[PDB]
Design a protein around this ligand. Structure first.
Ligand code: ADP
Ligand code: ADP
Ligand code: LLT
Ligand code: LLT
Lengths: 226, 226
């Protein structure tokens, strides 16, 4: 009965900035943030650092941990007795789909994951999916669209240590896979329904300060149709 | 309503040999073998080989894959509509407990897994446990006890390629952790109930040919008490 909407975008496109705006728009809207802070101290080791420090060594470990910690947080929001409100909406920061079809797929293609790693990752992903898939199905997607170059500047502005080494090239690859999935809708997934799911594309290259009011109307308008 | 019994022992103690004997003893007994054959070809890569080829690189990947593939096979035996028989018994080849408290714990202590790897492994283990723990709870344990030296000879007899490099030292460590857990019952787990679970210890150092008949009576006797 809970509508589930995922917020997709490249690294530093402004997802957390966008997400912090939502609860104040309506009392019925809940948000499940990406556990990024938790990833840099496990329960400790900073596995997010290890990922960027040696992707050939740590991609598989990180990517599978990232996605598991996302599943758990998302499942915990569903059980989390916030079903009782009039018309409840739950925004996911990223989803199991991008975790796999964008982030993990990209590192495999960059040879940061070998065939064995990629095969085990997928096999685990599928299994996670049929156990807790139906409950996590998306009613809609919001794509915060920004150039790789803008993202690169925003990694600098935010100043998250582990991400300061990310090159433009890495962000460019993530960009084209987002565009293939969310704009051209050309990316093949194992999930039929995703190809019909409504998608709102918002251009977030300009300052959040003077686009706020318009972005909000676009979101409110988009939700009505769902 | 299904009694669940796990068969524990060191590498090549004779678990599969013992297990092949059970279905013929009673029509109501089912067996969940360790998916070892599947581990040497993933769905492919031989991740069991990689584990022994470079334990510092592959222990975490293997150990977590080993345990997941064990959970799934075990859950599939429970759902697997073999509840309809008079007094059903399900034998597990090893369990989630040894996977963690013996095999994974040993590699962490040998520095084949770092703190981050060990922490993520445990955290995933716990989470797997509270999701599908209650359904997998053991009513009993059968410890096939053999000297590390006997096991070493049996790794040679069996001739499984990936395991041909295993040194005595590795088997000795596994032996003492089994003895600590199943004989002295001194090993601390996160699972209270395990410390009260009945355990049958069978000495399997002699030839299976002239101990068969006695082992069987011991098993039949043991099951009655449960
Ligand atoms: N539309 C925008 N205009 C100007 N600055 C932005 C905009 N969106 C995000 N920022 C800034 O960029 C940085 C990264 O944004 P953040 O929301 O943390 O990204 P994400 O959550 O997508 O990784 C932060 O410093 C934030 O203040
Ligand atoms: N009690 C026994 N006496 C003689 N040979 C045995 C005995 N148990 C096992 N074997 C032999 O030892 C090898 C390893 O046994 P297996 O059942 O495959 O071990 P596990 O399943 O514990 O890894 C096989 O060659 C098997 O024929
Ligand atoms: C969900 C996800 C995020 N990321 C990165 C990891 C962080 O740098 C950033 C968090 O916004 O996203 C991945 O590399 N893989 C992933 O699966
Ligand atoms: C269940 C399990 C088995 N093993 C090993 C892997 C195989 O060599 C052998 C199968 O009988 O047991 C592990 O190293 N870790 C494990 O968690």
């Amino acid at each position: 009965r809970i509508k589930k909407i995922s917020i997709e975008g490249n690294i530093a496109a402004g997802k957390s900035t966008f997400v912090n705006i939502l609860k104040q728009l309506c009392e019925d809207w809940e948000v499940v943030p990406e556990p990024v802070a938790r990833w840099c101290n496990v329960q400790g080791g900073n596995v997010l650092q290890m990922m960027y420090e040696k992707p050939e060594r740590w991609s598989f470990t990180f990517q599978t941990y990232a996605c598991l910690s996302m599943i758990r947080a998302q499942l915990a929001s569903l059980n989390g007795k916030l079903k009782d409100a009039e018309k409840p909406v739950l925004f996911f920061e990223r989803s199991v789909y991008s975790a796999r079809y964008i982030f993990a797929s990209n590192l495999y293609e960059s040879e940061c994951m070998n065939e064995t790693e990629w095969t085990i990752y997928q096999d685990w992903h599928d299994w996670m999916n049929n156990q807790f898939g139906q409950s996590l199905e998306l009613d809609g997607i919001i794509y915060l669209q920004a150039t790789p170059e803008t993202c690169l500047h925003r990694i600098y502005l935010r100043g998250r240590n582990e991400e300061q080494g990310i090159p433009l090239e890495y962000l460019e690859k993530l960009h084209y896979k987002h565009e293939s999935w969310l704009l051209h809708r050309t990316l093949k997934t194992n999930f039929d329904y995703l190809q019909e799911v409504p998608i709102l594309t918002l251009d977030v290259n300009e300052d959040f300060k003077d686009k706020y009011e318009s972005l909000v109307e676009k979101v409110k308008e988009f939700l009505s149709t769902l």
